[PDB]
């Protein structure tokens, strides 16, 4: 993993200062080192704990966990609400006819 950048990309704060100027540990991208406070990333406490256990990729580094295509910058993917892994629409299982309004949970989190 790339050496983590010790500040949050969104608020500039270190682990000592989130947006409320309170201490909060950073989540860091394994590929580029970009970091964010979970609160700045808008991750729930449950998502935060899971992501800290995984090799997390930031929004720019994220590749599809099914096909792992390098892809193009213009491509889109869903982000799992339980683990934050990314999946192309065409790579989701079960297949989706449309984007869910609420939470979406990937096939790694809930095999089905």
């Amino acid at each position: 993993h790339m050496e983590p950048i010790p500040i949050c990309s969104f608020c500039l704060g270190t682990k000592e200062q989130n947006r409320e100027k309170k201490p909060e540990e950073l989540i860091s991208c394994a590929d580029c080192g970009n970091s964010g406070h979970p609160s700045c990333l808008k991750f729930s406490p449950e998502l935060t704990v899971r992501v800290k256990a995984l090799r997390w990729q930031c929004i720019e580094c994220k590749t599809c966990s099914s096909c792992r295509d390098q892809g193009k910058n213009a491509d889109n993917m869903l982000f799992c609400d339980s683990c934050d892994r990314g999946f192309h629409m065409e790579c989701c299982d079960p297949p989706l006819t449309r984007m869910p309004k609420g939470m979406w949970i990937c096939q790694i989190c809930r095999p089905r």
Partner: peptide, 7 residues
């Protein structure tokens, strides 16, 4: 749901 291009 969240996507790369809406985030």
């Amino acid at each position: 749901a969240r996507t790369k291009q809406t985030a």
